[model samples]
Target: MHFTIQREALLKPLQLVAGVVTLPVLSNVLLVVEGQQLSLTGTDLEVELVGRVVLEDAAEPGEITVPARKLMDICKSLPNDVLIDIRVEEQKLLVKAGRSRFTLSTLPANDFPTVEEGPGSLNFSIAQSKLRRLIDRTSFAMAQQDVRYYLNGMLLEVNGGTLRSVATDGHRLAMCSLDAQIPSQDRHQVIVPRKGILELARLLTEQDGEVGIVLGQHHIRATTGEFTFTSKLVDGKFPDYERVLPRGGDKLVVGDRQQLREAFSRTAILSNEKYRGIRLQLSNGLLKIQANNPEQEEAEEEVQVEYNGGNLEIGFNVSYLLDVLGVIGTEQVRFILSDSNSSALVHEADNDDSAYVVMPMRL
Candidate 1:
């Protein structure tokens, strides 16, 4: 089969879906071309993504799997608007663009692995942009190498009308809640692994297409326009994030998000390499931040803010504070702390859609 298409027409889909491929583990990408339909898929056992491209010219239907990097580089070097002709001879791929022609090795589609596409059980639809936003808010808090392996992932809990994404690495938690069109009336809960959340977010676009989710025992299938992503969910239970966040704590100084982030960033420069801790001294209407290291050097900054709770000194990883404020995106951030040893709940002055619960550190 032979058909021609512009370089971008082929590159856009491949670039987005190619990140799912693990080069060292899965060297070859599965390419399926039939009639005017072309698809590329990659899987690393934990996650899989498939993308499709429609040909400009319709001809005989054919299917073949080719090397992922080879195809990507070919499409990259070609002229932006150059038309490429792809054909299959025996088991090899013949690619022609302008005056340059290249023949690349190909593999049969039959040998390529496929993520099981079973009949969906509980399917729900959501706006691409909205779903991506929900993940961005909380994904940063997911644990990396904690003993409680479950903390390494985000929990996606679906209720009657609202959907919540909860993530925490024991030290901090970020939760984002949004509304979804329920495909069923029952309640459900699932812990979406960290890699799954990241890849799914990358695949989402600003377009108004709805994404479908099919839940499995340890995996969830996410289908978007022209692509389907299947990911193995973390099996352990995510900690009760709501219960971990301290309740009705003593209110402390409220500072601007930008100022808070800048302060943390600058103070963290000389902070402990391992602990990365910074002390916050709150009193009257001003907040003082101090960071010191084994070198015996300290950086201090003060900001005027609204404070009425009590005299409090709390220690936190400067980087974590910066991340929380960056994710929340608010004018003023409120820190409610019980003491220097208790976790502090970070909230916006007027927004309630997002919240960060940060654990205090010993300085």
Candidate 2:
């Protein structure tokens, strides 16, 4: 393939799709020049992304696969606004910018692995920032691996204008709900592969507009303008989050979100390194966060809270609390604790966009 393009234009696209090349040929990005567009594709088979950028000049229309790691570095290393000259010769992709010229070993584009574009059962468009918010707010609870693999991925459930994202680590479950201009009335649910949600989230930023999401029987596809991200979907089902979130917790408390998060962080320092347990003591308007370790070290942080419910003490995984706090962008955090046994309900004091339930722990 041959094309002349600006450094910034080409570099951004390369940055988005430059990974998953374990095998010799698999590690290369497929470059194809057609008309005024240059298409760059890199895949690890299960997940694939194609980034298309405008060409300053299309010299010869062709296709080849070259090492993506070196390709990305070369673009990043080059000077700003420099016109990049790319072409294929001797089955090698040559990149020339000013005095710096590099050659990358190539494989035929036909040999590169790519995901099949299956027909989608559900397709809808959502505002870019809305989807980004949905993913960011819930993905933290997505587990690494579970007895049921579906728990490892973020669950995207859509029905009409309502869009919900749910995730769980078996200890805590997170849920984010929002309204989108989806045309479909049928309820559709899909579990996106963990890595796919990660990569997809990275690509979601930049130019806020409507992004097209298509969920099929086997694969899920997301497209924003000329760029595309496609991933194979998780086969199993997700837990019903409507029943997952604890409700009617009479013990309600509101605390300064920032203050409580910092208190937990301080207390965690003296917590049991293995169990990561931290204790919370609630009494009227005062909440005490305390931690004790095997070394007999202790930490206590008290934050004035607004609680109409009765005084209660609970233990929780300190890390889970920290993770939930990181995602909640709020001035005050609202908590609804039922008892020492039921999971605790936590969310923004003013915002109802997202919610979380951290399972109680035995300290």
Candidate 3:
């Protein structure tokens, strides 16, 4: 079969569909040309997605799977109005653009593994903005390559009318919740596998439209616009994030976020080369950050802060502190702790919708 599509018309969805492709995988994007419909599919072993568009051409029906990145690069480099034509012959896919034609290797569609569709029973929906916020506010904190395994992804806990997204490494945690209504029986928690979580985050647009969520015992499907994405869940229990959050600190320290960020950046220059540790000396109304390295050098910054507690010195990985400040994107930051050993909860003074809990590092 043969059909032609403009370069620009295919690039947007091609980029997105290509995201689901796993690196060095045997399978690639499948192009299906039917009566008037062309569908592009990408899948690794655990996740798969299909994107379709209508083409008015009614050539011989055909289906071919080819290297995802190569096909995308060819499409992206062509002229704006360039038309791409695909046809299957004997044993290869003939690709043609203006004065350019190449035959690409292919694989049988039957060899493509079947995608485990999410259990259609547990279904619900939420606005893209709500889902997008949950992803943006917490996905960054997800543990990468953690031995805990379960910590490698964010936990999605959904009730009938409320949804919460939580993520953490051993050192830091981020949590956010939103409002959504769904079927009552589908109240359950699942870990949206790390790869799917990331791809889904990128797929969500800024629009306030609602997307369908289909949850199965082993897989989860999210359908938006004209595309559907399904991913496998990590089969393990996520730690109890709320219980680990520290509470009841006798002292509270508040400082400007930008000021503290700059302070940490300056001190980090002289922090220990291996541990990158810094010391925070908190007193009545000021905070002194001091860091020294083996080179017999010291970097210190004293920032004016609002605190009324006794003198307390805390050791922390200076880089973690900077990450919290950078992600919070606020004017003021609050630190609550009785001592350095207790976990510190950092919150944006202006926005309560999101919060970060960080465990102190040993000096």
Candidate 4:
């Protein structure tokens, strides 16, 4: 096969597809040339990225497998405006652009393990921004290398006309939802592995457009204008996130999100390095944040808040509170609590679509 394309047209997708490739020849990227489109695909057994580029011409239709990293490096090092010619030579892949020329070893396309498409069940289209927001708001709470292996990923759920993303690390949980209708009556939940969620998030852009999603029994596929992403779902049941959500929290505290985030950041400096605990004291109209280290160093910050609940003091890991505050996209934040021992529910003020729950710590 032979084709010529501008370097600028190929660099971004090449870099993205190269990230999922492994070192072995069989795990390398597969290139397919047909008509005037060139398809590049790479998978590390968990997640796969397929990128399509329009070529100047396709003299012959063929397929080849080559080292993803080497080919990407060669293309990236070339001048942006130059034309790149790629072809399959005798047992090798040839890349030429301007005065640069390189020969790369190739593996037979038949030896490459291509990700097979499954007969999908639930299919729908949702805005890219909406999907990106759902992932960003919850993915941070996913556990890393947890004993409960299912906790090491985010839970994606679709119930009728709504889409939800939930994540937890045993200490805290985050849940976000959007309104999107799919062809399903019962609630469908899938545990997307941590790496897969991250890769999908990277591909979603904020531009206004719809991303077609196909959810099969084992794999989930998302198709954009220029690329298609497929990922193997984690084969485990996710915990019941509904049971952990605070239902009857009477105490409510409303404060400026920026103020609380800054207060938490400042108090964290004096918190215990090992435990990172901070205390929040709430009263009629005042909120006080206090932190002290084992070295006797202390920090205190008081902010005027809209709270009319009975006096309550609670201990929490400073990082957990800071994380929720950082992701909340609003001017005001509402904190709901029942007692000092129970978990606290944090959500953006005036918005009921997303919430964060952080379990209390004994500081």
**lDDT against the true structure, each candidate:** 0.81, 0.86, 0.82, 0.88
**Candidate 3 lDDT for residue 333:** 90
Segments of candidate 2 deviating more than 4 angstroms: 19-21
Per residue, candidate 3 scores C-alpha lDDT tens digits across 1-363 of: 688888877777788788877334344688887788788888877778889788854566878778888888888888888878878887688889999988888787766667756455577788888887898888877888989988888888877677888888778888887767664554578887777898888888848677888777788888887788888888988888878788888998899999999999999999987888999889999999999999989998899999996898889888888878887767889888778788788887866668788888776
lDDT of 1 at 47: 84
Minimum summed lDDT over a 10-residue window in model 2 is located at: 17-26
The TM-score of predicted model 4 comes to 0.95
lDDT for model 3, on a 0 to 1 scale? 0.82
Clashing pairs in 4: none
Query: Evaluated with TM-score, which candidate comes out highest?
Result: 4
C-alpha lDDT (0 to 100) for residue 62 of candidate 4: 92
Which portions of model 3 show Cα errors greater than 4 Å?
22-27, 182-187
| Residue-wise C-alpha lDDT for candidate 1, range 108-194, written one tens digit per residue | 777676666666446677888888888999899999877888988888887887888888888889988887856546767788878
Put the candidates in lDDT order, highest first: 4, 2, 3, 1
Evaluated at residue 228, the lDDT of candidate 4 is 94
For every model shown, what is its TM-score relative to the native structure? 0.92, 0.94, 0.93, 0.95
What's model 3's TM-score? Answer: 0.93
